[PDB]
Design a protein around this ligand. Structure first.
Ligand SMILES: C[S@@+](CC[C@H](N)C(=O)[O-])C[C@H]1O[C@@H](n2cnc3c(N)ncnc32)[C@H](O)[C@@H]1O
Lengths: 167, 96, 99, 108, 86, 105, 96, 79, 98
DNA sequence: ATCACAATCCCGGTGCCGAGGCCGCTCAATTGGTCGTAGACAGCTCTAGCACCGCTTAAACGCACGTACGGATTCCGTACGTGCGTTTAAGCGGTGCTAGAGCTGTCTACGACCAATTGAGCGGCCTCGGCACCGGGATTGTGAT
DNA sequence: ATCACAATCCCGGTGCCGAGGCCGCTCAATTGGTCGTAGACAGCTCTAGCACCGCTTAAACGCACGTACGGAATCCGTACGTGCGTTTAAGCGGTGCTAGAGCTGTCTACGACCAATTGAGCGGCCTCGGCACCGGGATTGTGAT
């Protein structure tokens, strides 16, 4: 029976995982979720199928921009109250960058609400030096739960406008 | 007469015939494999003894043999060795 | 009157002297708490840590990084440099047997 | 009496469960040794032996040879990252080293 | 408005903290690429010790990672720590 | 001279070291002189570190040993440093040394 | 209430310090570090003595096993002086 | 005088197995000193093991035990 | 006539000795060195042939690993020649040297 | 690009010794039944780990600047590598010996085990000096004048 | 060189709290004795480690020569250290909550242990094929055109 145990090295498992994750990045295969209305929150994401920890949930897609245009567009959204704040900063290697999702499209990572006791977290994914911000489940999630994460704004002035800490 | 030494020669040879039926092993390589088996046995058993002493347990069970295996061997080796050990202990229990 | 500014390096020497004279932990406590809990959440969910446990982790980590940085400084001086570069850390860890 | 079926055959192992149990008892590791502890340890030893021997046989067949020599064991251990980590502070006699030259040394 | 940005706990080991750690090692001058690099190495070190530590907690059937578990995990890696036993 | 430590002229507990050897799973029997010898070695090493620690405390004009003094004592003596080469002492710091190439010219 | 018994080398390290430096004290952290050092060296020497007993097929730890373990572990003058003072202690113990 | 028995070409061969392309002229004495230090450190432990066994012969088991005490375990000699 | 450029024979020799497992130090000089060293510790000592062979195995493995670390140190210094300072740095990083 | 050219690689025969298989035994692994105790499990306590809220502020962060330094280039001399011929000593093979390793057999001192005694060492408490913090004066390394 | 001048060292004042010393208990070290057996030792066997010797090449060594490279000097760009001003989140402290760490009790099933048995493994022996060496054409980096 030539019994030869199959043991993937710790050099192919992450390789077989990086390409198993990025195949939802360059593609828009955003399955397993639905759009719903949540009281006080408006549009939100509901999981229609079971999610385990480490399972990819949804990519936060948008225009990848620099900080110099970032600040100008942030001022623009500050001037117009009805535009909203869909923009989201991050850091990569030795430089800061950002993603703009204010333009209303079919991308569904932008429509996710906020919670400090949520079930998902945002992580970076590098593809040929291109960052992509992906929301991934932090724990086992059954179908029907609302997808939530931490907006990463524990600022004094941000809480003044949007004081939804918990519950 | 006498001069009897305990070794893992035949067992390493049998597992070799299972994994590579058409190949053999030299005396020096068999000695190295025996030394490897002795070293790993001593390492895992010492870690299991330390585990038992830490938790004030005077018995080495399968649980701290498993814990010692997880402590010593790196990641994927630890997972697959734990799988094999649990499979073997299940088969042994299902044949009392 | 031109304001006073120290030549580059002497403040670094003073920091070296003060931080080698002292024994206080150099990494902030609460960020280390958070990093330990976040990095331990991949191994067992809903864990708890004794305060002394994170204390021991912080002391161990600190000591490890200080020894690593001493080896890195030696590897930098070997390369006829004063700056420590990432390649110096890579060489130190390769020689130490970690990589 | 009943037929003696040993304990390696009970667990489907080639390594001696009884001998491992005897070594654990005589190794003075603890006051008592569980029944499943030698079975688990023998299974782990058999798995590690199987991995080492599989990679060594692959290395030997790569070198157009049908007998495993210490060089093949060394190549198997040092080529597999995990086994190299396990046997990092282990010297294999008559094993040599991996063939590798730093890129800077090669002529341009 | 707002300052929406992801926070990750590895950045809690700040650039000045790394600078202090290097000063205690006797480093005058530090490349800017050290920080991320050493951040990574710290993570690696932690990923080892805590894993061993949590394995100990898993064996004792405890939900709390005790100081003694970390001491055991460090002693396993040839990094024995004094002053936390008992 | 009821206690074995008093009999051996030692301050470390010969009886406690004997009990620890018996309960530590080292061999099924432990000799009579083994705990005495090991206790003597342990108290010798303790005295050797504590003398240098007290010297470090005097050099720091402190009358109490702290982890810093123990670290200085261990790393200053080459043989103690070799014995404790793979340990890190909590709150001990490091030896004060700046490389000569680093010092300004 | 009435927490359990805990064994430590605190009082003996204190007596040794008072014998060496009669006017110098020791802090709780430094005392804990001394306790950890004593435990570590005891464990190391006892493990080496157990290894010596198992290597030579002897089932007992004698003063000679501990002497050889000390010679193996402690380097340089430390081994010489530790061996001398342990031999002095065993001689005095056997005399009385 | 036996330390010079580890000849210059032997040091060159050892460096070649380590992947060294060019070897300085002062490497040989430094390597002889390093080998002497390592051999003294191992041999002291080995002779300690023989003394404890009350043997006048340094066996292979004693040598591999000395190596293992230093974290340099050797496979293929009865360990 | 014919003469190889310096370095190429060195690369050929590196490949040759990294392909083989044979001991590189001559056995009798190493055995005499071992006996001279052991004379310091205990006089009139006999050595098993397997004991000297184990010592040679360990010594050559240690020297080869040390020379690999030395080569890494030399390359780190933008060099190709290994120098005694490279050995000293490798040993200090490994923790053997003070 | 083109050339010859030593070094390497490959294919085939041969011996030859080390690996692979078989036989008898013996010693250990197996089977079975007892005992007692280590451990699993249930329950209780109370410790401490988690989580929050407010405020202070030490420290991290962000920015401008200049300078010390990392790095590329160039060149010089020497100190390496490579090849030659000569010396030497490693190595193989054989012989002799004897010191010491290994085993056996007696048995005697030595260590585990047990009953009982008690005092050394534990915890709990108090208390006061070493020490940390602080303020001020004097002294000092540093860098521009 | 002289002098601000920021930094550090040194002199107490004083409060804090933790190290140290005392007292109660209690349980673990001691004492004395019994018994089994571990290894100390005496003697025998016989293995292999040492010592020597004699060729025989493989290997080391000494020298020549030149070429690459180590190292020093120079110049340039940049990036990091230094300081300053803003922010931020670390930390302290104070308060609750309850999860689970630790302890206690019970009861049990699991492993040590003993005795008898037999079969698997090991020493011993044979035999035989794969690997190492030799020997000739295929090849392939390599250094000079
Ligand atoms: C990433 S956008 C979400 C998209 C948009 N709010 C919607 O529902 O279509 C963030 C905005 O949603 C609002 N928001 C986020 N989390 C919320 C919550 N938990 N409850 C109410 N509003 C929330 C904030 O005011 C913020 O401006």
């Amino acid at each position: 029976p030539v019994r030869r145990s199959s043991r993937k090295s710790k050099a192919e498992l992450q390789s077989e995982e990086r390409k198993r994750i990025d195949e939802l990045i360059e593609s828009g295969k955003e399955e397993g979720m639905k759009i719903d209305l949540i009281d006080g929150k408006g549009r939100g994401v509901i999981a229609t199928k079971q999610f385990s920890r480490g399972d990819f949930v949804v990519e936060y897609h948008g225009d990848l921009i620099e900080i110099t245009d970032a600040k100008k567009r942030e001022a623009l959204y500050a001037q117009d109250p009805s535009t909203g704040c869909y923009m989201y900063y991050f850091q990569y290697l030795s430089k800061t960058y950002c993603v703009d999702a204010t333009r209303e499209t079919n991308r569904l990572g932008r429509l996710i609400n906020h919670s400090k006791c949520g079930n998902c977290q945002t992580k970076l994914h590098d593809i040929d030096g291109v960052p992509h911000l992906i929301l991934i489940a932090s724990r086992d999630i059954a179908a029907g739960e609302e997808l939530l994460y931490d907006y990463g704004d524990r600022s004094k002035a941000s809480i003044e406008a949007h004081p939804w800490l918990k519950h | 007469r006498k001069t009897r030494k305990e070794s893992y020669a035949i067992y390493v040879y049998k597992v070799l015939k299972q994994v590579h039926p058409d190949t053999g092993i030299s005396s020096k390589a068999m000695s190295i494999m025996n030394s490897f088996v002795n070293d790993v046995f001593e390492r895992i058993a010492g870690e299991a003894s330390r585990l038992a002493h830490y938790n004030k347990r005077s018995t080495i069970t399968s649980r701290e043999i498993q814990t010692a295996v997880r402590l010593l061997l790196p990641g994927e080796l630890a997972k697959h060795a734990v799988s094999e050990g649990t499979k073997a202990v299940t088969k042994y229990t299902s044949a009392k | 009157k031109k304001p006073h500014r120290y030549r580059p390096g002497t403040v670094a020497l003073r920091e070296i002297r003060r931080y080698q004279k002292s024994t206080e932990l150099l990494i902030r406590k609460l960020p280390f708490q958070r990093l330990v809990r976040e990095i331990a959440q991949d191994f067992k969910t809903d864990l708890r840590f004794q305060s002394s446990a994170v204390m021991a982790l912080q002391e161990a980590s600190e000591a490890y990084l200080v020894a690593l940085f001493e080896d890195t400084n030696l590897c930098a001086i070997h390369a006829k440099r004063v700056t420590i570069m990432p390649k110096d850390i890579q060489l130190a860890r390769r020689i130490r047997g970690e990589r | 009496r009943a037929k003696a079926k040993t304990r390696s055959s009970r667990a489907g192992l080639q390594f001696p469960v009884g001998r491992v149990h005897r070594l654990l008892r005589k190794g003075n590791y603890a006051e008592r040794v569980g029944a499943g502890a030698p079975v688990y340890l023998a299974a782990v030893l058999e798995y590690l032996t199987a991995e080492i021997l599989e990679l060594a046989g692959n290395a030997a067949r790569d070198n157009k040879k049908t007998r495993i020599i210490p060089r093949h064991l060394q190549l198997a251990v040092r080529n597999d990252e995990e086994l190299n980590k396990l046997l990092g502070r282990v010297t294999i006699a008559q094993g040599g080293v991996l063939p590798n030259i730093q890129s800077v040394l090669l002529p341009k | 408005r707002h300052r929406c940005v992801l926070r990750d706990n590895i950045q809690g080991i700040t650039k000045p903290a790394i600078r202090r750690l290097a000063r205690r090692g006797g480093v005058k001058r530090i490349s800017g690429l050290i920080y991320e690099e050493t951040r990574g190495v710290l993570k690696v070190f932690l990923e080892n010790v805590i894993r061993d530590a949590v394995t100990y907690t898993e064996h004792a059937k405890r939900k709390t990672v005790t100081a003694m578990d970390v001491v055991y995990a460090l002693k396993r890696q040839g990094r024995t720590l004094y002053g936390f036993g008992g």
